[PDB]
């Protein structure tokens, strides 16, 4: 599945969105996976899933610290967006 | 908008020797390369005096590393204008 960004740098407190795009259309569903440990199934005004098309959007609101992993989506997989948060 | 081909995805290699890298896009757009390193962030790649090198054939956009050394350990990417695209990048691994 095609993923973008790949890489996404931003400032703690900020938003983001990725984008997956797929016209083989089944059931959809991103993770995030922090380092080397099993990647957890993400669910939603701090996360947000939408559809429109062949894309899928999801989107981070207030970002953080403990935000920083790999963001991909699977369907019944992309090598997905590393999210790296920042500050002030 | 348009999805880049990239070949390969990852590539172990001594130091001091030579790598290739192919990103294959048939659109137009003005296409890039990018290196992160570490926890920097992405950089629009540099000449490298010359080490590192971008040639270019049609549609197959390539990157070559000569005498590797242990400071390209990184993540390299192809990023194109259309939104922008990116490739799912090559992982390199020096030894």
């Not at 922090?34 to 005004?45: A, C, D, K, T």
Request: proline fraction near 2%; hydrophobic fraction near 30%; glycine fraction near 8%.
């Amino acid at each position: 599945i095609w993923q973008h960004p790949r890489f996404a740098a931003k400032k703690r407190s900020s938003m983001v969105k990725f984008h997956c795009y797929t016209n083989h259309s089944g059931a959809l569903t991103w993770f995030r996976k922090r380092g080397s440990q099993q990647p957890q199934e993400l669910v939603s005004g701090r996360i947000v899933q939408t559809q429109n098309g062949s894309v899928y959007t999801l989107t981070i609101q207030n970002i953080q610290y403990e935000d920083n992993g790999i963001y991909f989506c699977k369907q019944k997989d992309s090598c997905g967006t590393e999210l790296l948060v920042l500050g002030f």
